[PDB]
Design a binder for this molecule. Structure first.
Ligand SMILES: *[C@@H]1O[C@H](CO)[C@@H](O[C@@H]2O[C@H](CO)[C@@H](O[C@@H]3O[C@H](CO)[C@@H](O)[C@H](O[C@H]4O[C@H](CO)[C@@H](O)[C@H](O)[C@@H]4O)[C@@H]3O)[C@H](O)[C@H]2NC(C)=O)[C@H](O)[C@H]1NC(C)=O
Ligand SMILES: *[C@@H]1O[C@H](CO)[C@@H](O)[C@H](O)[C@H]1NC(C)=O
Ligand SMILES: *[C@@H]1O[C@H](CO)[C@@H](O)[C@H](O)[C@H]1NC(C)=O
Ligand SMILES: *[C@@H]1O[C@H](CO)[C@@H](O)[C@H](O)[C@H]1NC(C)=O
Lengths: 206, 208, 132, 728
């Protein structure tokens, strides 16, 4: 079996900049690498089947090169419709192959998460449960980790996190960490983000 | 314009069989080899199997070598896949693709739509909606099965509206949300299988 | 250079495996093929050595008690064709190809070179370079 | 059925686990590798020579796994799976994939685009030359074989049956170059072999099948393979996968699929014409089409014999054209079920003449070693020859004489009937006697001359034929005539249509092609061609519409190269018929310093040289310019000593005074003071001798110096070696 290592793991650039994602291999394989593009939720699509060999409906902006060890993919001009993850395949030796993949997220400026908490259980509390959540909206980059005053675990549902795709305008994400205790078994939303000087917390206690 | 439509999926209890077929549109099936390619949710892409032109010698991937049965004929353009045994880790999205030439060098130009195979014993249940105060979001938790469509008011929030994908709890039920940002509205939540709608007005309340 | 006749006799199968690489001892060697109309009838076993400088394939016969060296890439390519037919089936065969799949994966690649010039006789004389 | 995965450790034995899948092997026979059964074992040994351990593996598989499981119906072409049930020997012993791949290294460069001249769905076969094939006689009987019992037969179309193919065909196995592709089984029709020093070409033709192996000593070999459009072929690569890689060639056609085995696709071939050769067989089933494109390109490389004596791209193109021509003829015959006598005679002559030019000019090999061999099942030449031998042994218009000689030349073992040669002698002399009157030759005459030459040059009796006829061919070539003949060739190539008409060399022929003169390429004669160009109104128009006025001077020089480079440049032709020229160690002979050579009587020949003669009896003409002089030497075989003779002077007796001829056998040499040479005229007969005595009253222009300038001077050369001047 051959292991494919793709570098870098993630690339965020502006529109029109040259983006370069290479793909490594355990074996000393000669020539053919196959690039694909998977947009989130979408089925994958072929781009280049050897190095420079691009053909299909995907625009001619793309290119590639390299021999014998590493093989690179280069986008001459980046476009807003290029947001997807990029996997590579090594066909030189059969047994199986594929790349780890590289996510490309189109950038511009840079925002920070606005932290708000949501206490009221009123129409809930008499139904036998309580829900107090914490929302991180319109923030870049992706990295934020949410901890609570109570020990973070799967039972509290704190480890449950869903992240929407970038907004079509500001290219910023939205993060939600849900705190739910069924049948009512100190609370704080601890946000660690690079756009912040310190991991400031907005708490709630009842 | 060449198309491939996949038929199969559903949910099957661990340790049983499923046959995923694939349709061929406009392409002559007797020409080029066919790929089955698997992608697990949140995970990457992993090749599975190749069928040689027509009924013939098929190359199997490492992991599934004992548990997989693959066959195809040029009559109905039917390329099936049979998973006889492996239960736990085979939950993923399966793709059907066709190699560029017959040779493996060039990978797969053609592609299919998709099929989602899941592994559980479950039934439908009801959802619930809770208000948020005073960024004005909604909340929906503990429902089954997918989907739940959540809109905002009428037509006017197409911007600031973010509807979050579902996440499976440990209780076997999913949960998600939807949000919008002002800096009084109503969150619109509808559930098809269990037929449930809960409308919750948003009026800012007191906090401590 | 120190050449090779293409054939050395072997009575036992254990000796074929222990036989040192021909490429290591010699410089340039000739491949030879057994004097029998139907290979299958006479053939006993196929021993292929991967890690050798020029990975070698050895065809061995019992009742003749001989071992012949033949073209490494062609022999195994030729083998996979006869056992690769669509009409052929069975789990014995499926085990052959799976092991035959990555045979050369670890070893030295084939020639990218170009054949030297000169006339080529037909396959009568085996592509002898003689013009007449 | 046993699969066993081992691990090797030290030299004792190895740890393993046995997994029999569906059947039984003796499990105690895994201790000693089963040679006992009718099965076969595979052992893949990975051991680092550094004395590490590594691992090995085993799969014991059964025997049967090795053995395999007009129209194309009854006679097919069957591809073979592998080397096992076909010839195994070359597919083992081959150095392919080890030292080299016959294929280009990149699988992307394999598939080629089909040329425009290739067949389509509208024209499943292709274009056919306009003098279209005569239809079978409705009420008549097709003979089993070709025959002629009469002279009328060689003129009228005579037909014979293709039934040779259905009965006498041979099933044979073909092995493509270097075991590049797996063996191919075809039903044989014919086999062609052309050999030389510089190259050999093997052609195998069968039902819906052709194999032409083209090989140069100075270049790469290539093999052209033609199989029916249905047939797919599998290339032999190093990959042990069960997948398929299609060997270099275009998409399949409506009729045939063509393959190219060779490395020339990009790396070697000069042009994008790698797809041009692949389209050869799909262009036509008319053998005249391919022999036309062979004849056209034949001349073009003779002009270019200056820079490169070896034209590599012209060797492949011409050879591939010869091969595909015979393939067309077998396949036109299998398809339409009837043959033609003049189709079978042609390929006998075309296989001689085109092979000679193939190896000599294109390959560069010594013309001494040029030879060829042809076996066609629908042609029995040996019999045809015997039918001819009794035809000769049982006035002739030039058309009738062409057919007699062409068919005399086409079929020969070197044995030619006495009446055949005696015809040829009569032909040349009758062209000569008319050529000292008029300035040009019609196509009927042009063709008649060709075979007449090829007949006499084919083999101290037959030797004395080659010499005296070399004079005659040389003599007919005059500065006046050569400009007409080289003009014909230029008009023929400019108005040439490859698609709708057959171009043939004997149609453009001329005595200057059979002449020894190396001097027609001199600036004098060349610039006389350019000023003779408008004399053919259509020609001058077309020439200026493509080539620059500078290119026209070159193109006119190119077509003047042919006459000097055809017979005179042949070293083998020279050495045999004029050994005297080469006898003592001589620079001028091999340096081309001898501009013109005239065979004298036995052991002696004249010659013309620009620089200082190192041998012979020298007569220098003092009326000529210092830097561009003219010296008539008289050479001898055993006499290599140098000396000088005396130019003497005689006069001409009154034409009707002496009815006796002492003059005949001499030569009239006319030249200017510019150093240029003009007219070499031999006095054949008393009729011509009388014409000499009349100045201004002669019908022969070189004899009358009222038609020339004041630079015209006359010398009379003698069989003795005596050199004289006419007073008048
Ligand atoms: C050289 O020797 C080899 C072996 O020593 C020999 O190969 C033999 O080939 C034949 C086929 O031509 C094999 O016979 C087959 O056996 C399988 C076993 O399952 C049958 O299924 C096959 O059936 C075919 O033929 C039937 C009619 O006869 C059909 O009904 C059916 O559809 C199939 O077409 C087939 O009979 C045989 O097994 C091997 N021999 C061995 C020992 O394995 C080869 O012929 C020899 N070469 C020559 C020509 O000398
Ligand atoms: C076929 O061949 C035989 C001898 O090989 C010969 O007698 C017969 O005339 C041939 N048929 C024809 C017409 O070629
Ligand atoms: C050419 O000349 C010959 C006689 O020399 C004559 O028979 C023949 O018809 C002529 N050809 C043409 C084109 O008329
Ligand atoms: C050569 O020939 C001429 C006439 O043919 C004759 O007069 C002369 O004597 C001859 N010379 C010799 C040396 O024999």
């Amino acid at each position: 079996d051959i292991q494919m290592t793709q570098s870098p793991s993630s690339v965020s650039a502006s529109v029109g900049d040259r983006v370069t994602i290479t793909c490594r291999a355990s074996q000393g394989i000669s020539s053919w690498l196959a690039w694909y593009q998977q947009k989130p939720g979408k089925a994958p699509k072929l781009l280049i089947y050897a190095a420079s060999s691009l053909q299909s409906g995907v625009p001619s902006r793309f290119s590639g090169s390299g021999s014998g060890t590493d093989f690179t993919l280069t986008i001459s001009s980046l476009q807003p419709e290029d947001f997807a993850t990029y996997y590579c395949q090594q066909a030189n030796n059969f047994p199986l192959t594929f790349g780890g993949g590289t996510k490309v997220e189109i950038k511009r400026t840079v925002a920070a998460p606005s932290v708000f908490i949501f206490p009221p259980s009123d129409e809930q509390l008499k139904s036998g449960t309580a829900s107090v959540v914490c929302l991180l909206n319109n923030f870049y980059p992706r990295e934020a980790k949410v901890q609570w005053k109570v020990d973070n675990a799967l039972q509290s549902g704190n480890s449950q996190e869903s992240v929407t795709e970038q907004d079509s305008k500001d290219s910023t994400y939205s993060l939600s960490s849900t705190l739910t205790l069924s049948k009512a078994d100190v609370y704080a939303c601890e946000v660690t983000h690079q756009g912040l000087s310190s991991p400031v917390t907005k708490s709630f206690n009842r | 314009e060449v198309q491939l439509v996949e038929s199969g999926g559903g949910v099957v209890q661990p340790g049983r069989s499923l046959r995923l077929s694939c349709g061929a549109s406009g392409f002559t099936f007797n020409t080029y080899a066919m790929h089955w390619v698997r992608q697990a949710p949140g995970k990457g892409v992993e090749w599975v199997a190749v069928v040689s032109d027509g009924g013939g010698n098929r190359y199997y991937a490492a992991s599934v070598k004992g548990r997989f049965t693959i066959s195809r004929d040029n009559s109905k353009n039917t390329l099936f896949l049979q998973l006889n045994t492996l239960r736990p880790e085979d939950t993923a999205v399966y793709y059907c693709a066709r190699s560029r030439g017959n040779h493996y060098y060039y990978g797969m130009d053609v592609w299919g739509r998709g099929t989602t195979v899941t592994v559980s014993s479950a039934s439908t249940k009801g959802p619930s909606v809770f208000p948020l105060a005073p960024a004005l979001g909604c909340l929906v938790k503990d429902y089954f099965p997918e989907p739940v469509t959540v809109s905002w008011n009428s037509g006017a929030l197409t911007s600031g509206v973010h509807t979050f994908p579902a996440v499976l709890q440990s209780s076997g039920l999913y949960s998600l949300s939807s949000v919008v940002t002002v800096p009084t509205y109503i969150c619109n939540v509808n559930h098809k299988p269990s037929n449930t709608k809960v409308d919750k007005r948003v009026e800012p309340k007191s906090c401590d | 250079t120190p050449l090779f006749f293409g054939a050395k006799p072997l009575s036992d199968v254990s000796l074929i495996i222990t036989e040192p690489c021909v490429s290591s001892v010699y410089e340039a060697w000739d491949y030879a093929a057994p004097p029998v109309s139907n290979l299958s009838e006479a053939l006993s076993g196929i021993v292929v050595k991967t890690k050798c400088p020029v990975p070698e394939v050895i065809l061995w016969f019992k009742d003749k008690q001989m071992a012949y060296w033949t073209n490494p890439y062609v022999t195994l390519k030729g083998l996979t064709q006869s056992v690769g037919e669509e009409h052929k089936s069975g789990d014995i065969r499926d085990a052959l190809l799976d092991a035959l799949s990555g045979v050369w994966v670890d070893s030295t690649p084939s020639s990218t070179n170009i054949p030297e010039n000169g006339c080529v006789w037909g396959a009568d004389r085996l592509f002898q370079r003689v013009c007449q | 059925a046993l699969l066993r995965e081992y691990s090797d450790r030290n030299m004792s034995l190895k740890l393993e686990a046995f997994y029999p899948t569906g059947f039984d092997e003796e499990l105690i026979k895994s201790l000693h590798w089963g040679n006992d059964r009718k099965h076969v074992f595979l052992v893949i040994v990975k051991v680092n020579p550094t004395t590490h351990e590594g691992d090995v593996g085993l799969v014991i598989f059964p025997k049967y796994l090795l053995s395999p499981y007009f129209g194309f119906l009854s006679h097919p072409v069957t591809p073979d799976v592998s080397f096992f049930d076909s010839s195994f020997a070359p597919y083992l012993t081959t150095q392919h994939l080890v030292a080299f791949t016959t294929f280009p290294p990149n699988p992307l460069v394999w598939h080629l685009e089909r040329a425009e001249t290739a067949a389509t769905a509208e024209r499943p076969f292709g274009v056919s030359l306009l003098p279209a094939r005569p239809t079978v006689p409705k009420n008549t009987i097709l003979e089993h074989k070709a025959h002629f019992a009469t002279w009328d037969a060689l003129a009228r179309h005579t037909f014979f049956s293709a039934e040779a193919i259905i009965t006498n065909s041979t099933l044979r196995i073909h092995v493509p170059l270097f075991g590049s592709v797996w063996p191919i089984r075809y039903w044989a029709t014919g086999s062609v072999l052309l050999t030389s020093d510089s190259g050999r070409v093997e052609v195998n033709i069968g039902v819906g099948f052709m194999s032409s192996l083209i090989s140069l000593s100075s270049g790469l070999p290539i093999e052209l393979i033609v199989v029916p459009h249905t047939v797919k072929l599998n290339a032999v690569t190093s990959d042990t996968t069960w997948f398929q890689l299609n060997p270099p060639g275009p998409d399949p056609g409506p009729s045939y699929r063509v393959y190219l085995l060779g490395r020339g696709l990009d790396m070697n071939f000069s042009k994008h014409a790698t797809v041009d050769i692949c389209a050869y067989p799909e262009e036509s089933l008319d053998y005249r089409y391919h022999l036309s494109m062979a004849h056209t390109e034949a001349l073009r490389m003779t002009t270019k014999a200056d820079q490169h004596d070896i034209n590599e791209e012209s060797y492949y193109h011409i050879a591939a054209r010869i091969a595909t021509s015979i393939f067309a003829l077998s396949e036109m015959g299998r398809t339409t079920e009837y043959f033609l006598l003049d189709e079978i005679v042609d390929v006998q002559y075309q296989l001689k003449f085109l092979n000679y030019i193939l190896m000599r000019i294109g390959a560069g090999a010594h013309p001494n070693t040029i030879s060829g061999t042809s076996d066609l099942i629908f042609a029995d030449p040996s019999q045809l020859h015997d039918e001819l031998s009794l035809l000769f042994g049982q006035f002739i218009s030039y058309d009738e004489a062409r057919d007699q000689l062409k068919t005399a030349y086409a079929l020969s073992r070197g044995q030619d009937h006495v009446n055949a040669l005696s015809l040829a002698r009569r032909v040349i002399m009758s062209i000569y006697k008319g050529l000292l009157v008029k300035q040009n030759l019609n196509a009927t005459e042009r063709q008649a001359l060709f075979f007449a030459s090829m007949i006499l040059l084919n083999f101290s009796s037959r030797v004395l034929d080659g010499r005296t006829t070399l004079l005659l061919m040389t003599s007919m070539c005059t500065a006046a005539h050569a400009t007409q003949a080289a003009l014909n060739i230029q008009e023929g190539l400019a108005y040439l249509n490859p698609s709708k008409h057959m171009f043939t060399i004997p149609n453009v022929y001329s005595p200057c092609m059979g002449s020894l003169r190396t001097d027609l390429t001199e600036e004098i004669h060349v610039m006389n061609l350019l000023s003779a160009i408008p004399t053919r109104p259509g020609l001058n128009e077309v020439l200026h519409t493509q080539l620059d006025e500078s290119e026209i001077f070159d193109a006119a020089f190119k077509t003047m190269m042919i006459f000097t480079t055809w017979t005179a440049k042949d070293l083998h032709i020279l050495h045999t018929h004029v050994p005297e020229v080469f006898t003592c160690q001589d620079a001028a002979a091999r340096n081309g310093e001898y501009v013109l050579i005239l065979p004298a009587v036995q052991g002696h020949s004249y010659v013309i040289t620009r620089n200082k003669p190192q041998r012979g009896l020298v007569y220098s003409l003092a009326d000529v310019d210092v830097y561009n002089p003219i010296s008539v030497v008289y050479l001898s075989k055993d006499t290599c000593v140098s000396e000088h003779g005396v130019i003497e002077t005689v006069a001409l007796p009154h034409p009707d005074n002496l009815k006796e001829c002492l003059y005949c056998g001499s030569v009239f040499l006319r030249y200017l003071t510019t150093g240029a040479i003009m007219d070499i005229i031999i006095i054949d007969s008393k009729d011509t001798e009388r014409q000499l005595a009349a100045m201004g009253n002669s019908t022969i222009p070189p004899f009358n110096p009222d038609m020339h300038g004041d630079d015209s001077k006359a010398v009379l050369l003698f069989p003795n070696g005596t050199v004289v001047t006419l007073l008048g």
